[PDB]
Design an enzyme around this catalytic site. Structure first.
Site, PDB file in Angstrom:
ATOM      1  N   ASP A  54       0.837  -1.202   0.000  1.00  0.00           N
ATOM      2  CA  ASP A  54       0.000   0.000   0.000  1.00  0.00           C
ATOM      3  C   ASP A  54       0.879   1.263   0.000  1.00  0.00           C
ATOM      4  OD1 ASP A  54      -2.741   1.331   0.481  1.00  0.00           O
ATOM      5  OD2 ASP A  54      -1.753   1.945   2.253  1.00  0.00           O
ATOM      6  N   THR A  87      -4.102   4.744  -5.034  1.00  0.00           N
ATOM      7  CA  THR A  87      -2.987   5.464  -4.384  1.00  0.00           C
ATOM      8  C   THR A  87      -1.704   5.413  -5.222  1.00  0.00           C
ATOM      9  OG1 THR A  87      -2.430   3.488  -3.085  1.00  0.00           O
ATOM     10  CG2 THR A  87      -3.865   5.128  -2.051  1.00  0.00           C
ATOM     11  N   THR A  88      -1.165   4.204  -5.357  1.00  0.00           N
ATOM     12  CA  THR A  88       0.044   3.955  -6.168  1.00  0.00           C
ATOM     13  C   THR A  88      -0.170   4.471  -7.595  1.00  0.00           C
ATOM     14  OG1 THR A  88       0.691   1.990  -4.892  1.00  0.00           O
ATOM     15  CG2 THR A  88       1.627   2.236  -7.101  1.00  0.00           C
TER      16      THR A  88
END
Lengths: 491, 491
Positions: A54, A87-88
């Protein structure tokens, strides 16, 4: 004027340094991108080991110095609060955005052209997303399990993604009430090492991680009257403490949850009255109990009345992997449910705990937003195609910035292929050609077989919000970064 | 006589050092000058990151050593208190003022000639400003939105400058009462991440950043009787604390704002009486509530009477981007309004918060001062033209100092063009020629298209106070600086 030791960067060096800092973050996380991404290990100053893939967790735990890396961290945190996933993806997009933009700054193209071009391209990209957006039922069982399971895949928990999606979809629908807003507090994530991930199950009620305060108290209570007190049950002298016990009994309470302590003298008298009790109860647990049972949390013991008591059909002390816990189940109309996560090791059920953090998230997003789009890089490729045509219409120097933005979107399907172990050149050529010929819901890359496939047929879709939020956050972040031309940092 | 380590500068070295210190400040801020100015990044000793283009913020946060740089900081602070804008402008003017003046000091022209010349030229410059000043309606909707929007442009918030100007113009007119004095405390600036800048809206009442102290209290109260107490509601024993609750109830209070704490025992009794309460209320919030509702802030709980209660049509607890806040709205005749600022990120709504800080400022200035002038460097060019003719009339050596002052005013249109990415030579020639031929309201530079245009036609105007205050502050600052010929600084 300025202290010796203070450092300053300006113009090309400020912009290169800042983009470099953001690039280093993108370099760190881009290898987790996709189902076939790998895991990182973060060890702090104390030796504590954090294993994850994450972007937010990684960015929160790591200690950066440069403000630009700190901004990407804060953006990643907003991405978590709003969407959970993407996110990434957003960091990788933002990295390529700055890489592309730097070529224009290096070419001596005025920063206002790059910024304006990105403002235009991002506005058109979101409009294109709304155009390709597919309307689905907010409570459609099928797409609910398709969103759920798709999110779960690429994780260790994917082994039982069918059982997990079933739990999460049913859990949300139970607690969401109206159409709708779901509160994550109403779906409790409980984890206990033992058994496998297949043994993970949903509990129609609340599981509290406490035990029966006395061995002399009943272990099973039916037609339970739950009392919630936050005042410690300790009174000098046995007669004075017994009075308190009698007052609790007088209300008709059979099950008692005390936030603070319970003196042994009270425990014995409570046991004589057949009242079971658990002390040192977490404030969160007192709240979940109040919500589900309809119990009213009372400050003063004297103030507790029969009208403050909640109902539970069965309250029973059970051992889960040896540890004694209290199950509050068979309530008429519970407002909260509990998901008990099982697995072979603590590190596994922690990975599952995160997996279902996202699963329950995206199912909630699908209920609130009935628009989804095709995955497998289909959107970003569709955007490349349409924003190139837009660039041609726009013309001037602005069309170059828009061309760079449109081309920058390719970093995602390109890096996905890299992590999958695929030849990115062959992928990008065959996928782009296949996308243009067959369409956006008749293409994309399937990293699981390592070839261009039909993402739509295979149910590979993502909420519209993922893709539109990625644009908003990423474009605003890189726009801000581009605006700084002079960095003055004190030691 | 003097400690070894003490440093001293005198004559040409004192004057060069001092002008240098002021020049360094001017060099720092001059790149923010204009709509097309860039942003700076200031990082303190703790790592805290401040991103801005405001001269005052930059000067407040940065730690200078030289007294001259400290004086420019204090001047910038006065500029903020009085006008808000014109900060960077005044510093740039003051810098060029000292650059021009130094040529005269270096030429061995007595300091009294330079000073007197600036006193004369500054007096005539303000007279010229009053001559070109255009009379407008203090409450003219059109010029109110033109001043507002013009101020907003060149900022990130310019995306929704139309919605912002609409909010700010209406907000001031609501709270200004008479013609007139507006209090910035009556227009509350509230910001919460979420949504876009387009979702920013004006609230006809007061939004308090608090929640309902108990879950058992009503979430919505109509025909509300607001009580304001600053005494903490905590009394030993339940009977004694209940007495206080009964006294509040006896007054007829339905909504209670306590500056200090509220004991859980009181919260429960308040809930039984159907009285909603919020504790730990900020002193500022207690004041805004008193002003709007007509509630009287009471010290002692015993002293609270029905005559001290304020009125609100609706008091309701609502979640904004998840956070629970209390809306005090639908009051008969509120004296305060709230502007709720929305946007994709905290850093964005902070930029908007500053943008509207200036927008509400300049609209207030336009109401109090019904004189405006043309922007786009038109004034400074008009002043160059007229003060050159004045210089010729003045003669002697004084006319050289006045010529230097008049020519120094060109630094603004010159630096504006630099930041816009324009060829300053072509700009200055074509603008000056166009100004002399067509006039002052038929010229100026438009940095947005990057060419000489008609500033007046495009509504590019600035309050007279901006330009006249710039003269006063700048001339007095550089005059003082010029007066020092000997600097003795202890270690």
């Amino acid at each position: 004027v300025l202290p010796e030791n203070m450092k300053r960067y300006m113009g090309r060096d400020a912009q290169r340094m800042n983009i470099l800092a953001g690039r280093i973050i993108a370099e760190t996380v881009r290898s987790t991108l996709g189902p076939k991404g790998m895991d990182k290990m973060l060890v702090d100053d104390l030796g504590d080991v954090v294993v994850t893939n994450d972007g937010v967790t990684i960015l929160r735990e790591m200690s950066v110095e440069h403000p630009a890396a700190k901004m990407l961290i804060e953006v990643a945190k907003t991405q978590e609060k709003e969407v959970g996933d993407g996110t990434t993806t957003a960091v990788v997009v933002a990295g390529e955005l700055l890489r592309k933009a730097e070529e224009l700054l290096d070419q001596n193209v005025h920063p206002t052209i790059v910024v304006k071009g990105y403002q235009a391209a991002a506005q058109k990209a979101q409009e294109l997303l709304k155009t390709i957006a597919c309307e689905v039922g907010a409570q459609d069982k099928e797409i609910l399990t398709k969103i759920a399971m798709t999110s779960i895949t690429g994780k260790g928990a994917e082994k039982a993604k069918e059982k997990l999606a079933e739990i999460i979809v049913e859990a949300v629908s139970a607690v969401v009430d109206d159409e709708g807003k779901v509160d994550k507090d109403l779906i409790k994530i409980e984890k206990k090492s033992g058994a496998s991930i297949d043994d993970t199950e949903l509990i129609k009620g609340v599981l509290v991680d406490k035990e029966r305060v006395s061995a002399q108290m009943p272990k099973k209570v039916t037609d339970a009257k739950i009392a919630l007190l936050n005042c410690a049950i300790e009174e000098t002298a046995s007669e004075m403490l017994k009075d308190m016990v009698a007052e609790i009994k007088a209300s008709g309470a059979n099950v008692l949850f005390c936030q603070k302590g319970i003196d042994d003298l009270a425990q014995h008298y409570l046991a004589k009255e057949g009242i079971v009790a658990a002390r040192r109860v977490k404030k969160s647990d007192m709240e979940k109990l109040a919500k589900a049972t309809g119990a009213n949390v009372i400050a003063a013991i004297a103030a507790l009345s029969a009208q403050d008591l909640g109902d539970a059909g069965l309250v029973e002390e059970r051992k889960i992997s040896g540890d004694s816990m209290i199950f509050v189940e068979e309530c008429k109309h519970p407002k909260a449910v509990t998901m008990l996560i099982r697995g072979t090791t603590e590190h596994v059920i922690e990975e599952v705990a995160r997996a279902v953090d996202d699963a329950v998230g995206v199912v909630g997003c699908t209920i609130e937003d009935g628009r989804i789009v095709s995955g497998g890089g289909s959107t970003e490729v569709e955007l490349s195609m349409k924003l190139r045509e837009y660039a041609e219409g726009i013309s001037g120097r602005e069309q170059l910035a828009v061309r760079a933005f449109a081309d920058a979107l390719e970093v995602i399907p390109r890096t996905l292929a890299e992590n999958a172990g695929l030849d990115a050149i062959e992928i990008l050529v065959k996928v782009r050609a296949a996308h243009a010929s067959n369409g956006n819901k008749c293409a994309g890359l399937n990293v699981f077989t390592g070839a261009v496939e039909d993402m739509c047929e295979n149910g590979v879709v993502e909420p519209l919000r993922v893709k539109t939020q990625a644009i908003q956050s990423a474009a605003e972040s890189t726009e801000m970064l581009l605006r700084i031309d002079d960095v003055i940092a004190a030691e």
